[PDB]
Antibody
Framework: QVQLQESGPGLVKPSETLSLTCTVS??????????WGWIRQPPGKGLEWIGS???????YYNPSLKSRVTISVDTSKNQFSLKLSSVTAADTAVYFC?????????????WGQGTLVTVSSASTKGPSVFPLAPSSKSTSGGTAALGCLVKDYFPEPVTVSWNSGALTSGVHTFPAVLQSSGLYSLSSVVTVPSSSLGTQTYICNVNHKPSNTKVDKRVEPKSCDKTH | SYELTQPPSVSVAPGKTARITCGGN??????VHWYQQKAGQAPVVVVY???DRPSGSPERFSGSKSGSTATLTISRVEAGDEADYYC???????????FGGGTKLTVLGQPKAAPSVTLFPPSSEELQANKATLVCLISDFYPGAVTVAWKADSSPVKAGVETTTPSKQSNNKYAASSYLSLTPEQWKSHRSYSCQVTHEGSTVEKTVAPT
């Protein structure tokens, strides 16, 4: 019966102030039977409740967040809102609004879809890529491991070819971590013939279109394990 | 303040019964609701723990309560039951909402596989650039749910860590990665460092040293 949808800015500059809005239909914001809630979820982590507000006036808060959160309702538009202040990289998350059914101790029975909020500068930054060299350890006999580290870039996405697409057998390119600083890192690996490590050439081709850079990176074995 | 404790991962064969636990200091005396959430969706409540009348849930879902461990029991479990389940309570200490950390329920549909781990130390290049990253690659594993601890001064490190969540790969198992962000001298100090991947009560460990 109750439906919710969030409106937000996508990207928010550090230190500044996040402001979301939620639109409801199928119930009035003014019901004594409901509270109205904000719930966030950082990517691949858990659900964190932010706060809940009643028309009546009562407002409940997440204790580690009370300091910086503000919540407001508007009966005329049948909407409600959130403001999160002095916003940091650790605030990047999907933010949900939900109806907060006041009974049985409180549950959220109707949810908006998400809205992702990344807090980061709007700036654009290509990546430094370094070689992940193959080791005596990076071998389980015949199969060796080696790759490229694609560190500190923004924003998504990044594309990683090997040699030049000329090698695609045994290449898993991992998803990227956003890491508290505002930046992304990813790695791409490739398994190879260890017997011919010292005769071949393995080159990462890293493309980050949002910066028009495109890095080639040759990954030679560990020089001190050279085989001559 | 008040905490709810959930296992990070749980795997059942189809048709078998899944038990998901939620630990809180006498959780038994409070309403305990459960939420299902599938990838890229919002949570749906799957246990309405109504006060003073029967529960609400789809067939074969049932929330049970005992002292200090609520339980979400899914019987004759089905593939489409694969999800993260969250328990939620009200800590009226307090006056706030509390969720557990969530549990990936995996409905076993292919043979179990331990993780193939691979740790990479900082590159000499990156070191010369006044940085240092450790890189733990985890691959060829099912179900897709690992937890990763870094340390090895044997002391738990955390604080430098970021870890991806598992993802389907080419050969239909799962892959994941963790990073321990250092500075060259931090790397220099300790004799060792280890990435230790827990996977279904198992543990594959790897270690590196500034040799």
């Amino acid at each position: 019966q109750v439906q919710l949808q969030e409106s937000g800015p996508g990207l928010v500059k550090p230190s500044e102030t996040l402001s979301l809005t939620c639109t409801v239909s199928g119930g009035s914001i003014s019901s004594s039977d409901y509270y109205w809630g904000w719930i966030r979820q950082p990517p691949g982590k858990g659900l964190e409740w932010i706060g809940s507000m009643s028309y009546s006036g009562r407002t409940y808060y997440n204790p580690s967040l009370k300091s910086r959160v503000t919540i407001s309702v508007d009966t005329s538009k049948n909407q409600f809102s959130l403001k999160l202040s002095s916003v940091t990289a650790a605030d990047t998350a999907v933010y949900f609004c939900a109806s907060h059914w006041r009974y049985s101790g409180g549950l959220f029975d109707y949810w908006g879809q998400g809205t992702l909020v990344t807090v980061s500068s709007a700036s654009t930054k290509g990546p430094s890529v370094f070689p992940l060299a193959p080791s005596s350890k990076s071998t389980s006999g015949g199969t060796a491991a080696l790759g490229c580290l694609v560190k500190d870039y923004f924003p998504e996405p990044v594309t990683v070819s090997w040699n030049s697409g000329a090698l695609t057998s045994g290449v898993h390119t991992f998803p990227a971590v956003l890491q508290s600083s505002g930046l992304y890192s990813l790695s791409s690996v490739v398994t190879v013939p260890s017997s011919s490590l010292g005769t071949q050439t393995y080159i990462c081709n890293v493309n980050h279109k949002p910066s028009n850079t495109k890095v080639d990176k040759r990954v030679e074995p560990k020089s001190c394990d050279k085989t001559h | 303040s008040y905490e709810l404790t959930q296992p990070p991962s749980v795997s059942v064969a189809p048709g078998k019964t899944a038990r998901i636990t939620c630990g809180g200091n006498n959780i038994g005396s409070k309403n305990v609701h459960w939420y299902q959430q599938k990838a890229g969706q919002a949570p749906v409540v799957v246990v309405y723990d109504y006060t003073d009348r029967p529960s609400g849930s789809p067939e074969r879902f049932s929330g049970s309560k005992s002292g200090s461990t609520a339980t979400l029991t899914i019987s004759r479990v089905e593939a489409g039951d694969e999800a993260d389940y969250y328990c939620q309570v009200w800590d009226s200490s307090g006056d706030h909402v509390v969720f557990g950390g969530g549990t990936k329920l995996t409905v076993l549909g292919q043979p179990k596989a331990a993780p193939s781990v691979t740790l990479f130390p900082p590159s000499s290049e990156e070191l010369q650039a006044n940085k240092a990253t450790l890189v733990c690659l985890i691959s060829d594993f099912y179900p897709g749910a690992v937890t990763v601890a870094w340390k090895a001064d044997s002391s738990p490190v955390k604080a430098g860590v970021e870890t991806t969540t598992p993802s389907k790969q080419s050969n239909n198992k799962y892959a994941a990665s963790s990073y321990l962000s250092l500075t060259p001298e931090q790397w220099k100090s300790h004799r060792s460092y280890s990435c230790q991947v827990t996977h279904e009560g198992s543990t594959v460990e790897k270690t590196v040293a500034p040799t």
